[PDB]
């Protein structure tokens, strides 16, 4: 297996969320012709690869991650031929395109499930996870175990007709596939994987890549939340008894037969268990998204917010940057996605127009200097921030946001202090901050739509929009275009280099080196705080030359780092 791998190792990925990128026909929903009309723009950012979020036929309970037919397109996004055309349009512009592979579960509207739920005697009954009910000391019906769904409530839904519980780690409308069933495996390989590989896509982002294989005895999850009755089972369903077997099968039957890239969502906590997924010697997948960085400011199982521990952040970056150079594996780096809040609001400052611009550049230096495959999310390049405090809870259309808030409403009997704390939690880390439509210009709804958008546009759009940043040399967009050019030109150090952490105990400045096998070495220093901090590069490098600062080289002062100032020096 000798492959073309440089294109995905060095490539810049731009993730498009179809419902929110560009509406071509005034119904308020983004669509594929709209995407096609903005591919020139996507290319102009420095993108090599487009990651298209789910666009298949789907009732949109979980905005496309509940799929009812892998071989058909969500009608608002366009026709089947619109999708074939999008692939060609990307290829025409020198852009690769990867689709989202969501096969841990399907919609409850998928024909497979309609048949499986039909009857215990149906041929596809075993294609999903059906378990009998249990009874307590008082004789009341209870589910097989304490598993909590990732979206709240029990992970088992009761089907009255067949008197059995079915598993759903996500919503009740997303029943989980039984990956022990070999007939289910074959139908998924045919419909979800090879159908699209045969129509010329360049690979897949694999949704929840670690949780396909459940442990046969479905035991109770550990007490992760002290005193709570239900417990999230992520820690026991990840890397299950058949997981590696399954990825090996996907590789042998499909991924190895085409010139593609595969990135899986979710990584183990250890280097060696991670290498079981991404070591090129394992012939499974190419790279993984780790949730570790995204978890530095909140704990989702307890819905709590916390201040970022700078030392923990250093250890978290090094943890997965380690893969490049010292192993035959690969890694990824990203600050934003369709499941996260905006990076400038969470890791920098969105307080003022000046701060929004400064913050966009600061985080661009942090991402651009990380080894592995770099991923951008639509709007990260212009610095879209979180929806402000004035946006009411009713605008948070995400099912996860609605479920959590409603859980607080029910369990606290509308305690207004509890709801305010719930709102504040969501204002920081809800998925809705990524789904507010892309901001093209200062017209009505930022030019995303001629009609009324499905989701409210962030009200900062008159200032923050593509049109306002295009011809301003000082904009976040032009900073991103420049730093991606810098990254490509110095790929030995930025893409493929080995990362080492210096000045570890410093709680205000993160300093790391990027070194290529040739010996060429860069030193990167980021002041994450709101105050100027004394910083002497001569204490970490004998000789250094400033290459760039996120605040402008002429504003860099020797002996210190300004608030949210990131600098790159060539050393040795
Ligand atoms: C949305 C996302 O849910 C899962 O990821 C999050 C977990 O639910 C959180 O609890 C938290 O996980 C932590 C683990 O509990 C902990 O053991 C440790 O590993 O750290 C984790 C981070 O603190 O954070 C996770 C990241 O948000 C789930 O695993 C992930 O796959 C889900 N995302 C995709 C799944 C679906 C289902 O189709 C979609 O709704 C999303 O759009 C997907 O992209
Ligand atoms: C103390 C803290 O103040 C500043 O942080 C503020 C931001 O500048 C504001 O933009 C605002 O951020 C909120 C966003 O508007 C909002 O969208 C939301 O989602 O989250 C943000 C709230 O967290 O409010 C912030 C005040 O909370 C300042 O920029 C920042 O540096 C300051 N952080 C200090 C904390 C540490 C300890 O970890 C020390 O190193 C320094 O005192 C500062 O770094
Ligand atoms: Ca539309």
Numbering used by the authors: 10 to 581
Mind quoting what the paper says about this structure?
We have biochemically characterized from the Ba type strain (CBS 8244) the GH13-family maltase BaAG2 with efficient transglycosylation activity on maltose. The structure of BaAG2 is composed of four domains. Domain A also harbors the catalytic triad at the C-terminal side of the barrel: a nucleophile Asp216, a general acid/base catalyst Glu274 and Asp348 as a stabilizer of the substrate to accelerate the catalysis. The active site cleft was found to be fairly wide, and next to the substrate-binding pocket at +1 and +2 subsites an enlarged space was detected that is absent from the isomaltase ScIMA1.
The solved structure of BaAG2-acarbose complex reveals the binding mode of α-acarbose to the maltases: it is positioned in the active center cavity with valienol moiety based at the bottom. The −1 subsite is lined by side chains of Asp71, Tyr74, His114, Arg214, Asp216, Glu274, His347, Asp348, Arg440, and one water molecule interacting with the valienol moiety. At +1 subsite only Glu274 is stabilizing the ligand, assisted by three water molecules, which are mainly interacting with other water molecules in the vicinity. Ligand residue at +2 subsite is stabilized by the side chain of Glu309 along with seven water molecules in the close proximity. The most distant residue of acarbose is positioned to subsite +3, where it makes contacts with the side chain of Arg233 and four water molecules. At the same position of corresponding loop, Leu305-Met319, the BaAG2 has a glutamate (Glu309), side chain of which is pointed to the opposite direction compared to that of Arg315 in ScIMA1 and it is stabilizing acarbose molecule at +2 subsite. In the BaAG2-acarbose structure the position of Asp216 has similar orientation as in the case of other structures of α-glucosidases. Additional electron density is visible for another α-acarbose molecule on BaAG2-acarbose model on chain A. It is bound to the enzyme’s surface and contributes to crystal packing: amino acids from chain A and from symmetry molecule chain A are at H-bond distance away. An additional PVP molecule was modelled to chain A of the BaAG2-acarbose structure, where its N-vinylpyrrolidone core was positioned in parallel with Tyr505 at the distance of 4 Å. Additionally, a water reservoir is observed in the cleft of the bottom of the active center (W98, W106, W109, W126, and W657 according to BaAG2-acarbose structure numbering), where acid-base catalyst Glu274 and stabilizer Asp348 are making polar contacts with the first water molecule W126.
